């Protein structure tokens, strides 16, 4: 949103596809526990943000999501993320040893070029399916609002901003030890 | 369950816990009646409900409650259920109300949950004793920003109930004349395990942090050092004289605080102007500037980590599940960037997806899942750690203090009190 | 639960309900045995099973049953479970069968659930008393299109059981010599709340419609008028002399019917040829042409709204959940477009996604969820509405009639009967 | 179906994308509680239909879905829909106050041009994730068979027919207070 | 539940089962204590844990266990729960360990589940009796590759417990001096129905295969023949003299084996070198070469189909659900392509998605779902099939043998034994 | 994987669409119980494989999926599949009489040309929603690794290899009587 008040302008199909392909690749990386490569997709100025969400009466609805300087499920810079990667490369990281089985269905991908050259505002919808141990099953859905920046890498993009808009007030799982 | 059998469940002298206390459905009901119904339970922080008309909704056991700021700035707490046919009176996490209206049949209530008037009153209810028919009210008593509530007509006041536990709360709640505000936002999540595992850990379980439970969370906070991390070994643990509270903390060794909170916060906490002001108020250079983590539980389910500064309530959901509702408190007057630093850090570590609390979630679930078995419930758990290592007359620290931060003496007190509560 | 304690659960003189009746698991089992096992329960409409061989499957409490049209056009009802190892005999919602075959081991049955023959009979079962070993049969008795069933050998026949409740059923079931057909399709949905909340509402709860429960559903049916809607205030409510049925309805005021059903239906219902024929048959111009909504429950779980014309059964799923299976009846001979109008309207309003029943779903769940708490179960609900406002000798309306459509006198009868049933 | 007995003819990628984008936009509208704008997408001759579905023996399977003149979860014209919109703009609409949190994953989008100029028969698959209050979670899946008509609006299309084919016999939620 | 009432639940002379035995929660707990706690339960095959250090994790009732190969090649089995605060000691399905470390507080264990050492031992636990505080150990006894375990101090050894049931196990376990290996991979799935339905079927229920249960699975294995399939009618059924085991099998008729296993396997099994070696070892041309399916249960929950060669354990999950953990055994020395053929075939047929076991899944769930009803639980199931058709002195086959492969005599023994176990 | 270690090369949009359309069609076939036509999509050398998956400690993670000569949820050639089709055309196939209600959301479709002319390696992500009887609901997710071969058929492709990578260790349903 701000950006998405107006139905996005049509884009070249190879752009739509370039971006969709990015996300599919990114999902394969996460889903296949290729964390090292996934972190490489994070731009140096990465801002990885997932606001807490609350049940509000519809007049009060402007206060649904936690704001700028307010507690949140995640709100990480590159340094905080580095530490997190360092966790999921430990045989002593119990929440991911044994590892979760995750799936990221990605759809509803909408693209708007941003002010800067080679940057894009994206809205996509997801379901994340997290299965672990014998019988533990968690199903999340939401929206990812990203800012992507073009890149000399083999992937073609780096993730500058990510805002995960979860469809949950209370988190219905015992943790959030994977990445959206 | 007759009294005799309830007594067998925990043996303090021997140091043994019957795991059935974490699983038995009937005991769970007794708990709701004999523990949660008569204890002071944490509902949140004052700054969560600032102006008059402001409310939040939580739980006091499994009874939902409305917590509302009044015109005279008191805090009213009523059962969140209309006495007519039981509909939820207030239906949002937080907001501001001039009044409340039951959406089933439209009974209306002042911001303090008094039934003021009822549709078609004259024709249908003209005899309606609106006071008798208002939602149940709870006693509200706060302690330096934390909001507590108790249903019980005649239980000791929060102040007596806390006893010398106040001393330890002060380490976080009273480091400045400004007091503490809560960073806005409460994070909520479901953990399928018994509430006592959570409560007990925060009461006395420094052991888990200082061994294998959080090896990776520590490593996450360290610069680019490996598995040769120095675990603090000097510290103390406190067991309340009555009521089942406990706290433990490290002294002098800034290593664990550095891994969790980073250098900016650890600095603010131990050296400089703000640390000095704390030392002065707290009456001791040690208390103000030398304490490095610290964990604590106010029995039954009020828990926080002074220095890290996450506060939480463990909301029971039957013997097999617990919700965590957690927020973060900062000194009201601490600088901008210290507050922000406390925010980023607490969420990075002691949150649902935090590099520490991630792993507690995973463990706790397993503990409970196993308990589904028969033989798994048939022998006691070992609560014999560090027996008979307590003086009860330390020059500085009140109550039953030990010099071994790695002890289950606090835990033993929690269960001993739970036992008193259950058998009475 | 001994009899004494079951009696304390509801107090009619005082007007108080113990909320444990909506939650206690053991009482739930008693209910299945003492209420559902001995009452006439609604299984559907005759036109749902027209030709011989036709069946539908539903429930009679939590026992699944097959409901099958026979060659002589009777209706057979048997427990939907093969007595061998309990497999489901009939495995579809509806269809047409010449016979039924158990898919586990192939025991076969006539369309009336008699075990006719068994594979390898001569070698393995030659002594098999096929009558003793047939699925349990229920007594079937219909009333003007509604199909009722009762397991109980010796309970009063449906006709005695209904008593003067027939009078009110007639308002919808007997407005023409043609009777009623059901529009094909039954809508099914799960609502996690106790069945009594649903039953009781349809029994006596006009109050909720005429206050805050459905303010938005009404607004949805109004032309482009706002929050200045005139709620009907003239009406009556009926409490059965025995058996716990009740009905309430508005008189003269076409405002609520207009909002729900629209002008085409409201017209058909109150003025013109078809309305006249109703008045004549019903013996009264008022009964036929002046009644504007009307809700009703045939105890325990048979409920409908004459005028709106949705019928439903509340299927109990433990104390904490209920399924709604609902369809819509029209006068068999009403014109094409009136029938269609009744279809579009009922589904737009009193359906799972209907602008009315949407909101009942939401409320009911909350009521139940709260009840999970301890203190929430520890004080009675208020059932004292409009006490002592009943004559039992009205010139026109039989049973205990009141002039206040806004009363819990019917509700009080429902619970009083439930109480009789439970304690006997 | 009728239309979908034969694998659809290939279509220009910009058409595929034009339609997919429509749906993504439509999902954003629903998911972001922008109901007013969503209703604007409904063509004046809107027919919004979601048949009841039944468990049938496979020979009886032609009778799976409720038919033309038969009870249904929804079967609305423009007037009925207007009333529904008027509900979800009320602080007294309890089922949507507080509001549900919804997500519409949209995929499997197949397009066939219809007889009329600028009309299209569409088949798409969905999952709807509905989360509300503290812990209430409902997951629906099914197919949407739509007829879309081209348009001078900023959206580019109006919805003429919608048939929601739910993958449920009994509805596994306590209501259907949102839109498919 | 007093002993008297437990006895009423099954009536052997009359042949009747009270369906409450499949549903009652309390009986379920008694079962966990009086059946699963004292019986030999199947944990898997030896070749699943070959080298020292190898483990798999399963269940012994609802207690999780670790099953570990030792340095002297013994098999250790301990409760998979650290006695400290109950965390899971081993957290993977299978792998290789030099040691185990509890991830909550880091207590460590040798590959046999002895607590070897404990962090901060000297300061905190110096008195810790590490033997008393090790996880509960189970007796391990294998039979020709199958790994069995029993908690009970003083129950008869596996060999006595099996009794003459060994004779029938041999049909699959001892057809060569090479013994059997398990094809790697255990398939696990959840079936919401009581474990006894599964156990009982494999014990005595040839009837279901030879009637309507698997008509389509048979058709799937036939060449491009329709509904004119010849069902074998010659066979035998065995009921153990003590302990509740049973087996049934076809003789001579290769029709069902052909449909399930195909011509390659059926050949290998009945004619040629490998079949001859079996006949020789088994002491009989019939036993080795004439037996065509065969099903069998070793009470309570150990089940397999010699000839098809799927083995499985039924893991109980309350009265209302059971997990199936199933693998496939082949003669260790059978040729490459026979092994592969046994793999493809077993998974195509007796697996979660197999053309046979697909349908058992579907039936069993229904059986249980129905049982949710009251009247559905109030009359016995029919267990009277083929009464009094047993000699107990057959020249070749030990125990109670019948000539009717279609009998519930085995089933009757299973329940009679269950009854002995429950009432003692 | 092997093939998917490196982010796939960009492909013509009509190829992306040709393949996506294949899958949508295939999903419609499965979801609409058109089994006869679905089997026709199976190439004569069909290899339909769904390995068992296990909870492993992250060093042991190379052993997560069952291997080549090891037990599995499915591992079928054309003959085995024919038999399975013959089952789901029986009024005596109880697990599919009455039939399941299934939905196949298909996304994350990535394409790499294989060695052979007109063959392609595909990775896609799925959710399968299986609803049956009154209240039975099962939700699976995973990845399908396929090899597709071009074709003179109306569909345009035949399925040569399918590897279903489920996100479950223990199967959380009472059977797998449908097709992934
Ligand atoms: S339940 Fe609140 S007014 Fe009726
Ligand atoms: S259970 Fe129906 S024939 Fe066996
Ligand atoms: S529970 Fe295993 S060491 Fe504490
Ligand atoms: Fe595309
Ligand atoms: Fe911890
Ligand atoms: Fe209502
Ligand atoms: Fe079977």
Short mmCIF file of C-alpha atoms and ligand atoms in Angstrom, two decimals, chain C residues 82-87 102-107 109, chain E residues 207 367, ligand 2:
data_model
loop_
_atom_site.label_atom_id
_atom_site.label_comp_id
_atom_site.label_asym_id
_atom_site.label_seq_id
_atom_site.Cartn_x
_atom_site.Cartn_y
_atom_site.Cartn_z
CA UNK C 82 -23.95 -52.49 10.58
CA UNK C 83 -24.07 -54.57 13.76
CA UNK C 84 -21.20 -56.75 12.65
CA UNK C 85 -18.25 -54.38 13.20
CA UNK C 86 -20.02 -51.06 12.98
CA UNK C 87 -19.34 -49.87 9.45
CA UNK C 102 -22.07 -53.03 4.13
CA UNK C 103 -18.79 -52.31 2.47
CA UNK C 104 -16.61 -53.87 5.21
CA UNK C 105 -17.85 -57.48 4.97
CA UNK C 106 -20.83 -57.29 2.59
CA UNK C 107 -23.82 -57.92 4.84
CA UNK C 109 -30.14 -55.05 3.81
CA UNK E 207 -13.72 -62.66 5.70
CA UNK E 367 -16.69 -47.24 12.21
S1 LIG G 2 -19.20 -54.53 9.63
FE1 LIG G 2 -20.72 -54.56 7.99
S2 LIG G 2 -20.48 -56.64 7.26
FE2 LIG G 2 -18.95 -56.41 8.73
#
